Structure formats: structure tokens, C-alpha cells
Amino acid sequence: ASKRALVILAKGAEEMETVIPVDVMRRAGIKVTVAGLAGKDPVQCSRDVVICPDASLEDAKKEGPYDVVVLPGGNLGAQNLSESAAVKEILKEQENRKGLIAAIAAGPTALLAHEIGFGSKVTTHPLAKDKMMNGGHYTYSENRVEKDGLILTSRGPGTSFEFALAIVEALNGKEVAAQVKAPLVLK
């Protein structure tokens, strides 16, 4: 069967960090569900791009489990994810079931807020490092993409393709990742 991905979209999310992973995962044959944190209504991203989710998080939550839960970045978006009780429950369940969790840029700070994967080696956007490291619950890395077991993190818009392809490789293998990468015309 095909793998399934849950992408949680909140107001203030970085649209590039949201669209690149959604697009690339779909190119990989992954069934991606773009779920709106606040509901079914369209979401105004950080640079004012308006994206309409496939469904509300409340409804997508009932259609689990997912092979990967993806948390986009964006300072305000990540803050909304960090303050969400629904997100806390989703991440704890994913962590418990040994499912992959992927967060990019400011996105990883949501893991800290919900006490997810403590002890993991992680990376974040440079400007989110201090927030992520508050309390020293993680070990910091400057790698563009960092994968420690079931916790996959990345740094920013410019690492979004690498981040997405890492998710594809983790779920569908290196072969599929290479096949999906070629047509993108990456460096």
C-alpha cells in the first residue's frame, strides 16, 4: 500500500516549507493530507500566500495513523503548533507508535513545546536555535538535514528540497527518492 503523510498547516506557516514537502511527497506517490490547524478554512501563510487545506486537523486526526507527521516552519506558524493541544496529542501518539516526525526551520520548536524526542540530535533555522535549546533537551547540529531515528529536522526554505527528499527516502526508499529528484533540476 501507499504511505500516508500528515502536514499540519497553521496561520503564519512558511509557505515554501509547506508546499515543497507536500509537492515532493506527492511526486513520490505518498498520500498527503494538508490539515488546517484552525479548521477547514483557508490559511494565510507568513508571506501572505493563501492555501486551502484538504481538511481540518480535527477530521484528519480521525483518519490516522500516518507514516509521517510533518511540521512546517515559520515563526508564527510554529508558535501556533506549539500552543495546540491537538498537535501535542498527535505527536505523542506518533512518537509512541514509533512513527516518523519531520519538522523544518522553526518547526522543531513545536517538538520542544510538546516534549517530543528529547535527547535527539536536531537542527533548526539558525534564528530558532536558542528557543529549541532552552533547557538543553536536545543536542544541536548544523547539518542541513538531521535525522536521528524517527526525528527528522531541517533548517529553512533553502533546505526544503533536501528535507522533503529525506522524508521520501525514509518512507519509499533511496530508489524512489532519486527518481523523484531528477526531474526537479536541483543542483
Added chain:
Amino acid sequence: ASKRALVILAKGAEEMETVIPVDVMRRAGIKVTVAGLAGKDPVQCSRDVVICPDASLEDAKKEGPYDVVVLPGGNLGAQNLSESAAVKEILKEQENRKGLIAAIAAGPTALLAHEIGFGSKVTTHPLAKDKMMNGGHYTYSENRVEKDGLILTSRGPGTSFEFALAIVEALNGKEVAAQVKAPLVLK
């Protein structure tokens, strides 16, 4: 005295090739208008991402002129742009006023359809080369980003950041382009 950009969004547009330039140009302080070819309704992109435009092309065309007209890629999206009489007029007017025109991936094939910038050195996604070169009205290039005068072209999702930063440099200068680039965490 901010610059203005018009991004024409049609069904089937490559969402990454649309969102990356929109986001990056806004980071550059450019006033970007995402105009829906078909109207004000949300647009279903190539990988099913739904984006709601800022306005319809019909209304956006009335608020011209723009310092740059941007044509996203996506096979089906570029086809729709190529068939549009409204797009033909907008591009001819921009070319006449000596304004910048930027197209990425399959996007440049719309230039051929509307007989824009013949004689220019251009690039496209590899799979769109034959279509673009039908009749030999352009000279092909494999450069990731090609700029011949007021005709700026690029190759695909993976060259979207380079494409967007080239637009920023052309409109706001290399200083601003560098400032905008740094926080993106590009390789």
C-alpha cells in the same frame, strides 16, 4: 517607491514554481499580486495544492503596469497561459513598455505562443525544450537561470530560488538580493 510584480496563476501551475518566487519577492519588499487567470476562485495546482489568488487577472490587469510579469511553470499551467488572449495582451504590453518578463520551467513556452522576445537566449525545463524550440525562434541554453535583456527564464522547481533571486536583483539590486538570500539557508 516599491516595485510591483504580477504573478499569473492558472490551473495546473507548478505550486513550488509559484510560491517560491512569490515568497522571495515579498521578502524583497516587492508588492506582489497573485492573479488568477480564470478569476478570483482558488486554483488547483499541479500537485493538488490549492492557492487562493489575491485577485482575478481581469482586475489585476487594470492596476498595471508592473515592473515584472511572472509566468510559473507546470505543463498544464503553461498550456492555459499559452491559450489565454488576456495573457497575450499583458505580455505584448510589457514587452512594448520594455518591462521585465520572467518565466520558469514550462512557463517560457507561453512566450513562444504569444510571440514574445523572439531571438532571445532562453532556457526551460528539459522536457519543454522541444516545444519551446519549435520553429527555432529562440536560442537554447542549459544555464539554470538565463537572462537576455528583459527576458528572464529558468528550468524547474530546483532552480526556483535562483530564478526568484534573479528577479529580485533585476528589480531591487544585488545588495537586496544578498540580504534576502542569507536567511533562506540556501547551499
